[PDB]
Symmetry: D3
Subunit: 168 residues, 6 copies
């Protein structure tokens, strides 16, 4: 089925330094979404720049924004993983909540585990520290996954609750 | 008080096979709603057919949806229970979330524990598996309860927190 | 296999009145034990005196203990269920913890959810309120299950995680 | 920075009596908010009237509502505390959810832990019991804090995760 | 009843700075123990020295142990509270687990929330950071409570679950 | 310090297929232990038979046990990770609990998440399915880590709570 999608997720340095990795993974395992890849790395500036595209960010935010994003991620630990499921990209975004923790609804990853605002991040010259990245859409997922992951690092296996989600 | 309502709930076979009974019940106990009846059973087709009325499901959806529903429930295990409280029917509906798990809001039962879509269920020709059923309204709760429970299976007792919900 | 067992559990009136049914059920679902029967009822006197047999209780304890068990249970709400699994009788006992809440180890149901002591219950002349009953052994299990359930109320189905516990 | 605020919170007598203090405190600690003051007391009538202002509650509700607020809080236990964080007043309100438990959205403190309605509270003549109070705005927060806390009871320290919220 | 006891608990500066106040308080509320006093303060050196008595700590351990306890607690935030219940002193100790986190049993506060060893702290010259303090015995509890709380700060009220613990 | 240790952990295929990765990881983050490496892979035969060394398994158990272990792990998904901390090897083992789920104490990963017995696994000729592997001792950890990770996959960074565990 073409509705079966893979999405790229990153527990960002704030999530990692706060010990929130298990909490994050569980949110996705609990709804029925399937972890099919995972690795932990220090992000060098080179990879950071390959993940957050300069052209993409400055035409949708600003140059200050993109600079502080690279600052946030470069030479800092992350936990990156791929989630697979029925229309997973949209579902993952729903579970993450709004980009701005101040606005993110309770029950979501960002609404439950973070709170600070854009006004504050702007005022301080730092990036928003919002726990998780998730691919915005299908084109983003397709671009992002190979940036973090080799083909042979994406695993194929059955979760025990598969029939409840995919049907059998 | 007539504001005190009873609502019929079912943890569906997906919820049962996934080991989610306790999770579902705790959601209702935690808010202060009171369990006043419970039974576990294999649903045979006759009962499936009394609960999901042909005329209702076909008017609101289709015959195929009805067929898929009868197939999902029939000869599978459910945990059926009755919840009592102040305007409980509406509150229980809020706690469950939207019918379609893809769109069910995080924090709700269906939002936290399931995720697949109507589009995908149509593609495959199976019912949506959304963990739990709850009576939609007062007329439905009145019809549904006696189908599942005899009068003497509906219990009367006081929860220890009663004065906080019902007042004393 | 002879090792597959069924055991009788009761969430006692203290557990029910405190809104702890979901909590208790989750403990068993989470290790991989399977719920195969459930009912809620107000226990009348003869049922209480069937579950707690005068001769067993006087023998293992005393008459005063029997009387206070009957008082605690009779005319009060319980949620009764049967759990199935590999050597489930011993495993359920382990999860419950020691009879006396004061000494019950943290991590068990009794250790996490109750705390008062035999010394106090004896001083006050009431039963220990320790949240949950479970069959003490195989002979008790075989006696206790049909007191609470008809044969047709014991369910046969497959948990989605069956292969991890029973093997396939 | 001007965006750093303090806000007054009260676990109301219902929350205290229901043993929900820990739950309420964790919600705020978990998002990154900082507890900078805490005390538990029996509220006498005099203090209740300083907290819930007659003129303000009457204009926005009625005299009946105010009397029942005073009756609810007076000579009852509360756990009061102050929360500091970036735009904390708004963030704490989002976390508490709607005044009326019936409509409070799942995920919020009020949505997860209480459920009764305005209609029912009117019908019985008691205040709504919604677990928690939090200052509604900057002005209320500046009035309420000194009513509950002396200046030397507001603590100044660093949480270990400070740099994730305030930056460093 | 002579068995009703009050004990002094302190969430230590490690627990406070790691955002664990709510987690700790919940463990006590959940078993049925009652919070009857609470306050948050920065501990000055003289108070720290009334609580950790030189003669007691040197006789029980060493001068180095007393010194590192004073240094850990002094000028740092604590959340101090009093717990009331049936043999609460012994029960509270069971729930905290062994003094050394390395050996503290899973399920207890120290076991679940900390881990390092006496061996390590001795090497480094610091106190063990084991989250919480609780009175060792009845004499200690009598001595400790007035050091932290005035008599008029110890509250008298009923938990809604009181009849399940004290009986009614 | 000599007491700083790294230990190798594996969420075995049962844990992965059951959606337990988050749960396991949270146990370690929660005590203060630091995740310093992670990957997910399908284990090939040679890697399984390097992790589980024939001679060591035959001496401590038997050839049949070795065979059934290799069948369990080979061509199945795992989540492998390294945990760093003060005497982390012994601590991780405490948190895992007894090898046999039936006996593993409630509070531990194996005790809360699995339950079946050695007697049953031998009866059926399968390996015990106990959710997690962790290095038994320092020699084992030193041998095991490079089998699963390259030097450059082991991360060096500070957790926000570091000062509470390592001291600062
Ligand atoms: N379009 C659909 N496709 C597949 N299954 C459906 C569809 N609509 C409803 N269902 C299934 O039938 C049940 C009954 O439908 P309905 O009464 O509309 O929803 P709800 O149960 O939320 O009130 C749903 O809970 C769901 O399991
Ligand atoms: N119509 C009402 N009936 C009963 N109680 C009410 C009503 N409106 C408000 N209350 C109670 O009075 C408190 C103060 O009201 P208000 O300040 O308007 O809400 P909030 O506390 O959410 O800011 C509420 O928390 C609620 O407990
Ligand atoms: N008697 C047995 N029967 C089946 N499987 C076993 C047996 N003993 C051990 N195993 C499996 O092999 C793994 C390695 O065994 P061992 O090293 O003895 O335990 P541990 O994993 O606790 O170090 C175990 O974790 C378990 O999966
Ligand atoms: O890193 V994000 O594109 O999910 O804000
Ligand atoms: O109520 V019990 O027979 O488990 O002591
Ligand atoms: O810090 V106290 O150890 O004596 O529980």
């Amino acid at each position: 089925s073409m509705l079966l999608q893979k999405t790229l997720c990153i527990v960002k340095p704030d999530g990692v330094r706060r010990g929130l990795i298990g909490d994050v993974v569980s949110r996705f395992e609990r709804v029925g979404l399937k972890m099919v890849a995972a690795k932990m790395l220090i992000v060098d500036e080179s990879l950071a720049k390959k993940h957050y595209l300069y052209d993409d960010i400055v035409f949708r935010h600003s140059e200050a924004v993109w600079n502080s994003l690279i600052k946030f991620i470069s030479n800092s630990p992350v936990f990156t993983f791929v989630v697979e499921g029925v229309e997973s990209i949209e579902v993952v975004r729903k579970l993450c909540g709004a980009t701005e923790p101040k606005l993110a609804i309770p029950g979501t990853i960002r609404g439950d585990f973070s709170y600070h605002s854009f006004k504050y991040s702007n005022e301080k010259g730092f990036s928003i520290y919002n726990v998780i990245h998730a691919s915005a859409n299908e084109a983003d997922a397709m671009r992002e996954i190979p940036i973090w992951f080799k083909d042979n690092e994406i695993l194929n296996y059955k979760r025990d609750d598969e029939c409840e989600h995919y049907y059998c």
